[PDB]
Paper text:
MarR family transcriptional regulators (MFRs) are widespread across bacteria and archaea, where they regulate various functions, including the response to oxidative stress (1–3), pathogenesis and antibiotic resistance, and are thus of significant clinical interest. MFRs are one-component response regulators, having input and output domains fused in a single protein chain. Most MFRs are repressors, and their abilities to bind DNA are abrogated by the binding of small molecule ligands or by sensing reactive oxygen species via reactive cysteine residues. Using this approach, we identified two potential operator sites upstream of sco3205, which encodes a putative MFR, one of 42 in the Streptomyces coelicolor genome.
Guided by the operator sequences, we determined through SPR footprinting, we go on to crystallize and solve the X-ray structure of a SCO3205-DNA complex at 2.8 Å resolution. The SCO3205 homodimers are closely similar (root mean square deviation based on Cα atoms = 0.16 Å) and adopt the typical MFR overall triangular shape. Contacts with DNA bases in the major groove are made by just three residues: Arg72, Ser73 and His77. Perhaps, the most significant interactions involve Arg98: the electropositive guanidinium group is inserted into the minor groove, where the electronegative potential of the phosphate backbone is focused, and it donates hydrogen bonds to both the O4' of the deoxyribose moiety and N3 of A3 via its Nη2 and Nε atoms, respectively.
Author numbering:
A (entry chain B), B (entry chain A): 5 to 163
The structure:
DNA sequence: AAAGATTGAGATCTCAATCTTT
DNA sequence: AAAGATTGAGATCTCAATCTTT
């Protein structure tokens, strides 16, 4: 039997709040200004960044840190509104590509500045360089920790 | 209305991943070992901590940083499985109390150690004291920033 | 009216089952 | 068989509408 010290509780509690408030603030900013939730927007960003604006489903899920299932549903929804389309992998008749359409790229161009502001104002404008450095070192460890290479691990995109 | 440096962009990414992986890891740990998602478990923890193991709805929402709507739905679900019950406020026939049942308390006693481990292994076991200090200072600013007292704001529990 | 809280519908996420291809 | 990916059902969250009490 362990437990958390009161000091640790304060750290953890303030993490939980912050995260829950950020996701809320950003989801809302994106739902009004761009018509989609934060996770979806992130998918478009990752494709926009990819070679030929495309990425195979599992690779997309891996970057997003979500499950293939969630990704499929999300891309059905994004395909419906025309921001994304799908193609077959030619060498492997099993794979599928998610490709960002022109119109999808135009929604990023239209909305990103808004979304960037919101992410600035909530976070980066409030932290000294030292803490920005410190935040990234910290989250990278937490992330690294939760996606080890070790064999039979429970990674979302391998679910 | 400036741009984000590439460094800042990378910090932000690694934040998003970490958070998305933690919520995933903890939701799953709590869904198997305790039969409920992380946010719900939090509600039980806050009541367990409260005087008389009870708290009025809006107060509960304010601690949890969620909306009243989400809270009502969540407490219907917790009431159904018997971990929570409701009472009327006697002075104000408008208010409602959320009270943690005995059996609900027994689910915390049973599961907390598991949940604490999972939160240790993912986070605290991986950070030096300096970074634990640093994390809390950082998130507390982000949180404080997103819930100002200054009236014309969009706080979940006031939605 | 506004405050406290709930409701139902539709959107999304999770889980398990399924299909095809390797 | 396992890998890549999708489906549908049920669980949960959001949004707007609603009800009761102040």
């Amino acid at each position: 039997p362990r437990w958390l010290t009161a000091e640790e509780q304060l750290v953890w509690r303030s993490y939980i709040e912050a995260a829950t408030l950020l996701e809320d603030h950003l989801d809302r900013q994106l739902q009004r200004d761009a018509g989609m939730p934060h996770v979806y927007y992130g998918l478009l960003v990752k494709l926009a960044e990819s070679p030929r604006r495309r990425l195979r489903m599992t690779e997309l899920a891996k970057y997003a840190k979500i499950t293939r299932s969630r990704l499929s549903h999300a891309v059905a929804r994004l395909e419906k509104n025309g921001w994304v389309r799908r193609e077959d992998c030619p060498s492997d008749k099993r794979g599928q590509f998610a490709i960002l359409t022109d119109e999808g790229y135009e929604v990023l161009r239209r909305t990103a500045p808004g979304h960037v502001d919101a992410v600035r104002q909530a976070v980066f404008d409030r932290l000294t360089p030292e803490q920005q450095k410190s935040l990234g070192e910290i989250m990278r460890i937490v992330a690294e920790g939760l996606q080890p290479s070790e064999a039979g691990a429970d990674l979302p995109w391998l679910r």
